[PDB]
Design a protein around this ligand. Structure first.
Ligand SMILES: *[C@@H](C)[C@H]1/C(=C/c2[nH]c(/C=C3N=C(/C=C4\NC(=O)C(CC)=C4C)C(C)=C\3CCC(=O)O)c(CCC(=O)O)c2C)NC(=O)[C@@H]1C
Ligand SMILES: *[C@H](C)[C@H]1/C(=C/c2[nH]c(/C=C3N=C(/C=C4\NC(=O)C(CC)=C4C)C(C)=C\3CCC(=O)O)c(CCC(=O)O)c2C)NC(=O)[C@@H]1C
Ligand SMILES: *[C@H](C)[C@H]1/C(=C/c2[nH]c(/C=C3N=C(/C=C4\NC(=O)C(CC)=C4C)C(C)=C\3CCC(=O)O)c(CCC(=O)O)c2C)NC(=O)[C@@H]1C
Ligand SMILES: *[C@H](C)[C@H]1/C(=C/c2[nH]c(/C=C3N=C(/C=C4\NC(=O)C(CC)=C4C)C(C)=C\3CCC(=O)O)c(CCC(=O)O)c2C)NC(=O)[C@@H]1C
Ligand SMILES: *[C@H](C)[C@H]1/C(=C/c2[nH]c(/C=C3N=C(/C=C4\NC(=O)C(CC)=C4C)C(C)=C\3CCC(=O)O)c(CCC(=O)O)c2C)NC(=O)[C@@H]1C
Ligand SMILES: *[C@H](C)[C@H]1/C(=C/c2[nH]c(/C=C3N=C(/C=C4\NC(=O)C(CC)=C4C)C(C)=C\3CCC(=O)O)c(CCC(=O)O)c2C)NC(=O)[C@@H]1C
Ligand SMILES: *[C@H](C)[C@H]1/C(=C/c2[nH]c(/C=C3N=C(/C=C4\NC(=O)C(CC)=C4C)C(C)=C\3CCC(=O)O)c(CCC(=O)O)c2C)NC(=O)[C@@H]1C
Ligand SMILES: *[C@H](C)[C@H]1/C(=C/c2[nH]c(/C=C3N=C(/C=C4\NC(=O)C(CC)=C4C)C(C)=C\3CCC(=O)O)c(CCC(=O)O)c2C)NC(=O)[C@@H]1C
Ligand SMILES: *[C@H](C)[C@H]1/C(=C/c2[nH]c(/C=C3N=C(/C=C4\NC(=O)C(CC)=C4C)C(C)=C\3CCC(=O)O)c(CCC(=O)O)c2C)NC(=O)[C@@H]1C
Lengths: 29, 161, 323, 160, 169, 160, 161, 160, 161, 161
């Protein structure tokens, strides 16, 4: 989502792209 | 981002000579306009949301663009469009403070036409909405700053077209 | 070996040569202009040494043709001329014993003296016919120094070998290579016609460019924009200079294709002005003609045998991007 | 300039220039006349500053002017004095700009690499700038000299 | 190639706006200063050769290395071409003073200039200094001629210097 | 504009602007105030000019707005009036410029192509512009109207 | 250009083999399609202007492209755009006749994307326009050859993308 | 091919295919089956054609196959036969295409350069292709043989 | 990334042949020159910084390039230039060891001219400096190995120009 | 374009010094070999066609390169390949006469990799052919001229690589 852009929303680096972007794989245990 | 002062000192540096009296005259001129520039920047920062709200209402709202299939339809796309208007306002304000269009050239307008044409964003409507922002901003900061914010807003429009 | 010998002797007695001439020209002596005059006298002799080592005195000729007008105000031209005679006499003295050495050194110094006296030439002012283009004035000495293209002309009553050679040059320019020499491809009727004189060389170029050979070699392989740029190279001897040129001729190639573009380029006043009806088109490069800042890289790439292998249209992209 | 350094650090966070930064620019533009005067005095006395400071540097560190150092002979010594002139000029640009940005970009980035690949003792260069700072203190009023000393201090700080 | 009038018209046309009072005010400013611009360009055109000669001598005294055998102006072949470049700058800058806009300089002089100079080996820094020397000479001449505002005459040369120079930030 | 025409021709010459050319553009900038006034009358009264010219177009050439015609419809007739507005705006640009090249750049290069695509009678477009010329001449004085007519008539001639 | 005949024979030539029976089947298929292809080419030849007119109406007109500052604005640019659309139609019909998209690749697509990005031509609008041309052409030349024209129209879209 | 010839010419003229040219390709597609049959018989009898025509070539010009000739020895004479086979294959390509275009590309361009540098006598090569033409005429019906004769004739004319 | 040995065997591999006797002769040639190549490489390794320093002094210092406004003037630009000269010398040494300029192709010259043209770096001045580096390297490693280093420096110059 | 005399004179000219004795020695060597250079050049002119014939037969002929799809298969391609070998021989003769490789760099090697990589011409096979030309030419002109012409053939080989 273009609302989540590091140029404009620099804080929201890590908010998942979601269905609008690639899948995000994270390791849990 | 070269400002007026950085540009003056850079030009003198390229020639190699220490700062000349004529260069001092130019620097004094920029220092003179510093009061209006800083005051206008403070006004724009406080009223930034209202500038964009009025411009969106004047130009973009209740048109085809904001109705199904118009590229400002989806809630995602609406938020992205208002964010872009914020971009133009913020960097125009940076340019006004600096006294130099270099920041616009370097960061804002480089590949803007190509990104918009790839995304499908109507560049004509973006130009019209930037004009609406120019008019609202001119009202808020007065004729002194509106004249300068005008030149930087029109720089954006000329490049974006 | 004689040329190096003359050079060694001239260098050995160089200080004497300069001092004798300096005494001759010591008119109104006494500072800064003195440093200039002594150094320039040395420079005259040094380029004379370089010229005798070289095959021709062209270094002296091109590098002193306009000097008199340039240095006329600060110091007397006649004073320079007399001192040049003095240096010639001393240089003649050291080599006066040997006929060959005396002849060579005398002739080259004579060129120096004559060129300094000769009136300075006017610049090769390039007046562009059209509005969009920009006029430019190369200094004449630069063009003289530049390597000289063989400017083939299809004059009447030429030698038989010359008529065949002129045809070959046209094949080389239009088709970027000598297709006749390598593949044997060519238009026999057209070659015979211009050898006979039945058609002009401008007509030969027109027919050659709209022939199926060019259509297969340089219009079929490319998008229309790149084809236009190649056509400017082959038929007009330069690359497009401005967006107005590209707009005009892209419209032409759009409305009539290769026959139309060939007609437009040969019909152009530019063709007639630089390549007459007899002349065969020749590429106009850095030294041949004054050059412009606006299409430098594109022209540099067009004037190469690797130019046909770009299929992205460089002139239009460059001119468009500039705005 | 202080203006561009404020803009750059605000652009990173994507904010309009915050009120404190705007106030900083307001003060800087108001005292610009004083800054231009300080740079005017240093510019006018540049010949004396370089000459006196060069003599002091060579006296304190004679090894550089001894044989086997970077500046041996009048040719190399003249180039060393020119480098000291360069850094005085960059300090004047820094005073006028109000920030170390002109100093950093023109002549503090890659100094180690350039001078190391020139065969020059960088600590000695730092002491040369220290000498220029002392000379500048003599030629400036106390309040002005403290401000200009900051730019000299930044040069020596990156140098050593 | 755009004058001040043509530039204002171009901006307004792209935005589809009839010329408003702000446009008329800026157009009026160009028209009011047009007489002074014409006089200044006439001064430059009249003294064009003299300005080039003085600027060249000043540049070479400032930077002797150019005239020395290493430099690019060393022999007379290059000295002639260098003087021609000085003439180019003055001619196009006078066009720019008449025009009142630096688009003439941008489109016909500055575009591709660095590429050309790097390829031919021409040094750009000395050329920037030469343009500046022309700027000072020209400003002196127009001020003597009676043009009170030399901002019109210096700004085109300044734009050429800024575009031709590197950043050196 | 006069200025650009002079500069372009001089540049092709490769000679500095001629004294005669300079005097010509001296006249142009002298008459700039009159030009701006004429442009402002047309611009400020654009609404009335377009509406009355529309009435004259749709009565002198009633077929174009009749059923089956290009302009038939509440929206099609609106776009036609917009085109008349476009050409009035170009004419004001040209009146300011003193030359017809701004008009010719933005329109009249390919109007035949564009309107032939859109299936429009270009003679009818020409008559609409002639109606604009008539309406505008009465909003200007006789001496001023002659200047305005020149820029309104180059357009019509190109329309044919 | 390679037509289907030339492509078959050149593919065999690269291997060095005489025309095989399988290659003969390929050539026979092209000869079978020949009649419908030539008929469709004549249809497009006479109705070329109408195809462009309809397509520009369906997609390009009454949008942000033709409003001031939209790139198709100005009569010069509207003329230029309809010229480019007719370029595509002519070369696509050439490709239908020949049976191979090599005409498109050689004479249209190579370098066009760079020139378009340089000039600022919106590329999404061009793709939408030529797809609109495909709809019109399918109607005029019929479905069976509309199947065929679509292959080459899609080729142009993919190249521009 | 006929199709490529028409399209190349029309593309150069920037013109949708002329109605006559469209009829020409229509006739080509109707005639295609006969062309394919002619290619089928020639390629099916390719070994016969090359073998007996090669014997005829060597018989007619034994100096060419004699010691000192280009086809001197088993290896070189075999390669000469292979060249004859190549030109039969190209003729089949030309027959299918309906125009010399394929043969005039794959061969027949710079054949003089290649062979003359190779040392071979190109008139002798022409005689070999003539022999192949005679054999093909025997293997073809009268009207069919005329067309294949045309393509063989183009080859021998290019050779000469 | 082909050395001479790898290039010889790779050509044989493409042809599908075991190593021929002529290929053995070429391999023998590389092995024969190997000792001088390795010795010169170690010499350049020891004198790497000095080679670049001498080249900069011989061709670039006290010139228009390093005086103000010359594109090597600012300290960041001087550091960048010597970094590039270090890059050239290191890859020339790799090329001498390998016997092949392919490393120069892939790792230096595949985009260098475009980057230099875009940045504004003067190609002619860099070529002068690389030529001076050739002279210095020839002296340090000896003339016999200097001819080998010379060909790879010339390769860099040809690609860069 | 520079001959050895031009290079020597220009180096002396940049330094400003009159032609030094070492420079005289370089020029004297060139002049001394002048008779050999001219003699060899006439030999090349007479025997150039057969030099190419032998070289192609030595390496390129009866090879995969002449096999179908091998990039010298077509008669066009064969004629062009022998032409290019003629070009290399002709410009090598020019380079030998001048005594400097500048002709090769200015005319032969400022587009060679672009042309050959674009066409698909196999650089390795061309290199083998040019080496073969060097051997044949050396036999015809003798050892002294075989060495001189050899360095320029090597220049072309390495540049192509
Ligand atoms: C006048 C009686 C004599 C004289 C004095 C003088 N010379 C200059 C300057 C220049 N002279 C030249 C001429 C040449 N320079 C060369 O390098 C060569 C070929 C090797 C020639 C023929 C040049 C280029 C200059 C410098 C550029 C310029 O125009 O100044 C001056 C001017 C002052 C100064 O120091 O530059 C003066 C007063 N030179 C003569 O040849 C006469 C004998
Ligand atoms: C109703 C429950 C509340 C409310 C809403 C309200 N909304 C608007 C104006 C707009 N709303 C939208 C919303 C969307 N656009 C979309 O594409 C989607 C998803 C499909 C949504 C939800 C937009 C774009 C507008 C702008 C006007 C337009 O559509 O052109 C208004 C009008 C506001 C104004 O001042 O113009 C209102 C009043 N108001 C309430 O009181 C409720 C709490
Ligand atoms: C002079 C102060 C400096 C200098 C210049 C110099 N220039 C050239 C040659 C050329 N200059 C240009 C410049 C332009 N061409 C244009 O169209 C425009 C737009 C107005 C400009 C500015 C060009 C194209 C050339 C080359 C071809 C030509 O001259 O037409 C040279 C010649 C270089 C050489 O060795 O041949 C020189 C030396 N030289 C100096 O020393 C100054 C620092
Ligand atoms: C009115 C006097 C006549 C007429 C015209 C008519 N025009 C259109 C549609 C369009 N006209 C334009 C024209 C311009 N574009 C430009 O950039 C300029 C110069 C600045 C001009 C003049 C365009 C682009 C269109 C297309 C729609 C759009 O603007 O996007 C129509 C509508 C046509 C239709 O059916 O779609 C009409 C009717 N019609 C008349 O009867 C008059 C004689
Ligand atoms: C139309 C669908 C869209 C559009 C395009 C547009 N194009 C141009 C100008 C040019 N178009 C080309 C195209 C080609 N050149 C070729 O050789 C080929 C293949 C045969 C093609 C398709 C070129 C080279 C140009 C530039 C030259 C010129 O200016 O004519 C313009 C005009 C640009 C200008 O500034 O004048 C436009 C507007 N514009 C649209 O809105 C459509 C989406
Ligand atoms: C002096 C304090 C020390 C010293 C210096 C020394 N410097 C040089 C030569 C050069 N110095 C520079 C440095 C700069 N260039 C810049 O643009 C800037 C910032 C604006 C700086 C600081 C450069 C580029 C050179 C060489 C090229 C030139 O012409 O400027 C030398 C000579 C090196 C040589 O061997 O040739 C020396 C010796 N020497 C000392 O002893 C001091 C410790
Ligand atoms: C030195 C002889 C000349 C010179 C060069 C110069 N280069 C740069 C910057 C860059 N150089 C490169 C070059 C390479 N990248 C590579 O991967 C390789 C192969 C290993 C090479 C050779 C690149 C990528 C850059 C860009 C880095 C950047 O962001 O700058 C500069 C710096 C320019 C600047 O403005 O900072 C310079 C000055 N300059 C000279 O004067 C010499 C003639
Ligand atoms: C036979 C009728 C005559 C003849 C020929 C002969 N040819 C060669 C060698 C070659 N011939 C070719 C020919 C072609 N290559 C092509 O791509 C095409 C078009 C598809 C043709 C026709 C080639 C390439 C060669 C070289 C070897 C190879 O194929 O790689 C020879 C041998 C020459 C030699 O001594 O080396 C001969 C003898 N010879 C005759 O006597 C006939 C008159
Ligand atoms: C022969 C050893 C190899 C080979 C070569 C081959 N080359 C071409 C085509 C071209 N060669 C050049 C090269 C030059 N042009 C020049 O002007 C000069 C001297 C300054 C050179 C070296 C060029 C430009 C072309 C293309 C234009 C043309 O056709 O002449 C081809 C043709 C490729 C094609 O089909 O288009 C071939 C086959 N082929 C081999 O197998 C050898 C390994």
């Amino acid at each position: 989502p273009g609302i989540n852009n590091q140029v404009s929303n620099p804080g929201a680096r890590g908010l998942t792209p979601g269905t609008l972007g690639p899948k995000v794989f994270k390791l849990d245990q | 981002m070269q400002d007026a002062i950085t540009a003056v000192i850079n030009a003198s540096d390229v020639q190699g000579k220490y700062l000349d009296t004529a260069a001092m005259e130019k620097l004094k001129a920029y220092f003179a306009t510093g009061e209006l520039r800083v005051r206008a920047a403070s006004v724009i920062s406080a009223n930034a949301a209202n500038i964009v709200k009025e411009a969106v209402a004047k130009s973009l709202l209740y048109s085809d663009i904001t109705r199904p299939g118009g590229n400002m339809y989806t809630t995602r796309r609406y938020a992205a469009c208002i964010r872009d208007l914020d971009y133009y306002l913020r960097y125009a304000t940076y340019a006004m403070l600096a006294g130099d269009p270099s920041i616009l050239d370097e960061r804002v307008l480089n590949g803007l036409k190509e990104t918009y044409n790839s995304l499908g964003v109507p560049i004509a409507a973006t130009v019209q909405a930037i004009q609406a922002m120019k008019e609202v901003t001119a009202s808020l900061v007065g004729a002194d700053a509106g004249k300068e914010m005008g030149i930087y807003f029109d720089y954006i429009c000329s490049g974006l077209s | 070996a004689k040329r190096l010998e003359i050079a060694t002797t001239l260098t050995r007695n160089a200080d004497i040569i300069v001092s004798r001439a300096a005494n001759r020209i010591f008119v109104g002596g006494s500072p800064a202009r003195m440093e200039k005059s002594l150094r320039d006298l040395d420079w005259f002799l040094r380029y004379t040494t370089y010229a005798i080592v070289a095959g021709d005195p062209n270094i002296l000729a091109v590098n002193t043709r306009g000097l008199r007008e340039i240095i006329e105000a600060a110091c007397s031209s006649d004073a320079t001329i007399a001192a040049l005679q003095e240096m010639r006499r001393a240089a003649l003295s050291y080599f006066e014993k040997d006929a060959e050495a005396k002849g060579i050194v005398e002739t080259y110094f004579d060129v120096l003296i004559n060129e300094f006296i000769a009136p300075a030439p006017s610049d090769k002012v390039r007046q562009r016919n059209s509005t969009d283009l920009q006029g430019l004035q190369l200094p004449q000495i630069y063009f003289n120094a530049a390597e000289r293209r063989p400017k083939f002309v299809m004059k009447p009553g030429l030698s038989a070998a010359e008529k065949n050679e002129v045809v070959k040059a046209a094949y080389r320019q239009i088709f970027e290579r000598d297709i006749s020499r390598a593949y044997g491809l060519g238009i026999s009727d057209l070659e015979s016609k211009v050898k006979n004189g039945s058609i002009s060389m401008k007509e030969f170029i027109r027919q050659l460019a709209k022939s199926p050979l060019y259509r297969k070699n340089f219009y079929e392989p490319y998008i229309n924009s790149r084809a236009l740029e190649l056509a400017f190279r082959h038929i007009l001897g330069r690359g497009p200079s401005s967006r107005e040129e590209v707009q005009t001729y892209f419209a032409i190639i759009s409305k009539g294709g290769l026959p139309a573009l060939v007609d437009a380029l040969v019909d152009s006043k530019e063709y007639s002005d630089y390549f007459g009806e007899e002349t065969v088109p020749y590429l106009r490069g850095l030294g041949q003609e004054a050059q412009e800042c606006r299409n430098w890289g594109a022209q540099q790439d067009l004037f190469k045998y690797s130019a046909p292998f770009r299929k992205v249209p460089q002139f239009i992209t460059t001119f468009a991007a500039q705005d | 300039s202080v203006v561009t350094k404020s803009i750059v650090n605000a652009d990173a966070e994507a904010r309009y220039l915050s009120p404190g930064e705007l106030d900083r620019i307001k003060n800087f533009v108001s005292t610009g006349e004083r800054r231009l005067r300080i740079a005017q005095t240093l510019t006018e006395n540049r010949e004396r500053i370089v000459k006196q400071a060069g003599d002091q540097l060579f006296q304190k560190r004679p090894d550089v002017v001894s044989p086997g150092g970077n500046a041996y002979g009048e040719e190399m010594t003249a180039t060393c004095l020119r480098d000291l002139d360069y850094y005085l000029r960059l300090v004047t640009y820094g005073i006028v700009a109000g920030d170390v940005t002109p100093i950093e970009e023109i002549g503090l980035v890659g100094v180690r690499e350039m001078y190391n690949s020139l065969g020059t003792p960088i600590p000695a260069v730092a002491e040369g700038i220290r000498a220029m700072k002392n000379v500048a203190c003599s030629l400036l009023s106390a309040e002005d000299a403290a401000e200009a000393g900051s730019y000299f201090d930044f040069v020596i700080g990156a140098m050593q | 190639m755009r004058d001040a009038v043509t530039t204002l018209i171009k901006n307004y046309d792209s935005t589809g706006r009839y010329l408003d009072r702000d446009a008329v005010d800026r157009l009026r400013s160009y028209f009011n200063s047009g007489a002074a611009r014409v006089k200044a360009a006439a001064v430059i055109n009249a003294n064009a050769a003299a300005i080039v000669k003085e600027a060249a001598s000043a540049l070479f005294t400032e930077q002797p290395e150019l005239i020395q055998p290493g430099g690019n102006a060393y022999t007379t072949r290059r000295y002639a071409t260098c003087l021609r470049d000085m003439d180019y700058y003055l001619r196009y800058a006078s066009y720019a003073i008449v025009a009142g806009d630096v688009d003439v300089l941008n489109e016909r002089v500055l575009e591709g200039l660095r590429e050309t100079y790097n390829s031919l080996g021409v040094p750009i820094g000395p050329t920037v200094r030469g343009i500046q020397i022309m700027k000072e000479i020209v400003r002196d001449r127009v001020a003597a001629a009676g043009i009170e505002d030399t901002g019109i005459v210096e700004q085109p040369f300044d734009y050429m210097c800024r575009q031709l120079s590197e950043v050196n930030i």
